Fold:
Amino acid sequence: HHHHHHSSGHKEKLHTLEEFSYEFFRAPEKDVSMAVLPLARARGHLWAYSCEPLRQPLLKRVHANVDLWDIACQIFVAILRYMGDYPSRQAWPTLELTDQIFTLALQHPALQDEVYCQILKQLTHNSNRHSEERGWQLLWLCTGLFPPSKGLLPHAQKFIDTRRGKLLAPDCSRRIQKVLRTGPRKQPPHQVEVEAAEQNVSRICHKIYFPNDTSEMLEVVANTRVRDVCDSIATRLQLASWEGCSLFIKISDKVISQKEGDFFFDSLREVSDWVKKNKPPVTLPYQVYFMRKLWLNISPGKDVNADTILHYHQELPKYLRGFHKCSREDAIHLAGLIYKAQFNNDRSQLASVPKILRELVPENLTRLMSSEEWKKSILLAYDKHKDKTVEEAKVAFLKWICRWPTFGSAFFEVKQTSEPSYPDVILIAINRHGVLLIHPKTKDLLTTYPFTKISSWSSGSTYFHMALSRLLCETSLGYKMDDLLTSYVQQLL
Structure:
């Protein structure tokens, strides 16, 4: 009957775990005594608020396993510390408390009811308004991670239903409904989740960055999946489709892609834990980016919004690094389009702005003409776009380069030791055609390894290898290559 909303018309007695305890809680410790030993006071109910730490698990099923006793007791202390009912001279960071409360319960589903019972116990006959407020914050965190069992659920629902007047109570009840639909979380609450709980705020917005130097605030809940955020981003930006687009975490010297069917807050913690371990207590700053990952079946003009927000600002810095094989004539034609996309009608910035040529011409082709020469040729190419919009210019830029073999690729400047036929330092490109090998001086295609022909690939922190002929690369970017190759290979319908 959790699928039901119950009513009587009036306020019912506040529901406790007293009746539940009689069957599922273990025997309460009643009272050999010595007059020298201290009294050891506060002999209240086991199912009601106690400022005294536990010594045995509350539940029979957790008490029946001696290995679970230590975890149960450590959970209760972190519960006490969190709620401000413990002598805490040592001010523990709230995340160390919340990790200690929920981490092992995600691992051992026996502890899941134990966590619920300990929070509900602490919310029963609690005369402290600070502690009660904090207790509701933990229950709120809990309902977003795992639900109570079949036997516990009716009691937990009635506990919330008889206290509907509590600020976070309607949300706790709604959250139990959601975690039953979408399943439990893999990670304990995140920094963001915990900071919103602490402020008694039940709505979270996370900032997402776009390649066009913009950002949006996206609404996220405990059960939000990485794909759900993309669906929201695609509605926001008005993209026809986000197929081939993914979210990325820019953290440390890494740009790590997020798995679509992973919970957003699970994905955040998993990546940070990976990064934290691969670097040798303070939290790691990060940015969340939405970008195109796989450039398969991209047709400029079909989705103008994706073209002007994503594709242009993604292709632009690659072209400027001079990764493509292009002429002085292509550079003049494209620099006029790049000028129009950025300055629109302001014609004077080409003379005014110093080092502007860096923003308009590939770094390799810069030496072909003098400063005044590029300026003269670019103005003439630009004047041809007076009746175009900034958006038209961005789509024209793309239409002209979209058929290029190196268009929509990820570039890696590795050190190869495999074939002495090729130069020492080489440029690798992963795109729709496969793994492309390019000469850095003359941008000629050395070889193309299609996906159908690749057998295996491995990467460490110091390298990347491939097999068919065997390719050896010395790079720190191995993780991104490994990931992009696996992702491209995995595209099968």
Observations:
- Residues 321 and 363 are 6 Å apart (CA to CA).
- The chain is about 40% helix and 15% strand.
- The first strand starts at residue 204 and ends at 210.
